[PDB]
Amino acid sequence: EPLEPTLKNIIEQKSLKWIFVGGKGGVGKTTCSCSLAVQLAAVRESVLIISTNPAHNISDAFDQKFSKVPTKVKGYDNLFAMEIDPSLGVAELPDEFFEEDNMLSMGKKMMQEAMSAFPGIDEAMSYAEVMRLVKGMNFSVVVFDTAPTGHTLRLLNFPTIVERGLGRLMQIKNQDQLASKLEETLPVIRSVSEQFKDPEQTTFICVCIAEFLSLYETERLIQELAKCRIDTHNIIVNQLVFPDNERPCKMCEARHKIQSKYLDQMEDLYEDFHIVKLPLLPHEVRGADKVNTFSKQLLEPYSPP
């Protein structure tokens, strides 16, 4: 009667291009997103994973360091990973063998120096790389890792605000050469914006644990996404504990009852949402083989012994 507690819909919906994973910190966004990307790679032609989260962990999750440029993930023929650069791409040859456009380039260099550590620079470069990918159209689907809920919301909000600002700037401009740069970038910007607003093109995966803070922070996140009109109809409950009735200790029992309370709360609260439940594995979840094994149950529904 209820929706299937599996992400099978995500795998099936081939029209899906952009997938975002978010929630409270430490719920497992990184591991869950890696698992989802691994599952997708088995179906789509090419899959990318992007860690917008500063101090990126996808390298840790896959136990294989990744550069800013996408690189192939060991053990997979079409899975690629990349860690966004919070800094600007200021690398370049030291200078030409003659004078240059220094009169113009110097202001740009000062701007880069100033904005290198600007608080919003991380998400700004994330949006820049999103635009670059939209231009490239290289990977069939791209998954995202976003650390907090608030900054994920800011990133999702960018397209709208940037498009509005660009439109207003055009109106003020037509009220010299750089105008080209506007018309060059307005289409692509718009192109991504609609994609973020189109449920077919994009979707958002909320991942949470069975606890008060996690549950209600997830609720706030869902409401904010509704405000931004970003589709989302599946949630990953992570780090569940199912007591081994053969040998249930005190802490396991208490944690299980707490998780049961909040999981029943979720079930009542989130009708018409797929609710995929993931147990807390004993061994660490790191490395391609472990991540693949953990992801297998992300599609096949889990059940306690």
Binding site: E1, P2, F212, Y216, E219, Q223, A226, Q265, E267, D268, L269, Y270, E271, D272
Partner: protein, 271 residues
Amino acid sequence: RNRGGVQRVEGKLRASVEKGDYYEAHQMYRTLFFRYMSQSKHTEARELMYSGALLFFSHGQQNSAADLSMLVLESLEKAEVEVADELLENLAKVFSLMDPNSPERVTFVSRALKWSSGGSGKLGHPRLHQLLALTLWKEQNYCESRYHFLHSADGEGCANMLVEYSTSRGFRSEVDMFVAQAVLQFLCLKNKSSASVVFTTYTQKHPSIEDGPPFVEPLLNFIWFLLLAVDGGKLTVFTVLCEQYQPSLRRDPMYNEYLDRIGQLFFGVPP
């Protein structure tokens, strides 16, 4: 089944409220409100938020009650409910229950006024302004009470509050100026009837002011003649009155500026 979740949620909210888990109850209220607004059950969501805000205020849960009141405003706005006197009364009641120093009241008021017939402008609806002014006056927030009264249309209550405020704080030499200022400000806006009624009431009721339209104080006589002229709308009379009473108008420079607006608003002074 597919909808039993909402009912179970509501029952759990009731149980938590009985238990006193006020913060958890507030969270449950927010969730229920969002779900209801999803189903376009706007009236039910608004009623639930109103009841919850009143309940939290009764228990002193100031912040939670304020948040639920904000949600009430969200329901009214998103549902585009036409202004109604009962809704204004409810909003004023909620605003009364809030903490005066808590900034949320401002955040609330600015929102509420905006919702109330937003087409008119920042004036919102005069009825709501009158209610807010009455509430503030009962709380002795004379500055904001006077502000709202001026934006209101309730001349009589404005005059009574001004009388109390003058007898409380103003100096003996300022008694007329208050009403004059108020009257002048009332004419900076197009509310001449409010100016007339408030001036009449202040003159009659105020003990320190002797009765009789021919007032002893030059400034009161000037204001009375200015009201009569605005009733007549004669620019020549207005200029004559302005020139003759210049020493009195100099008692406060702001008066000059008001006159200019008045001249524009009632005597065709060029912009």
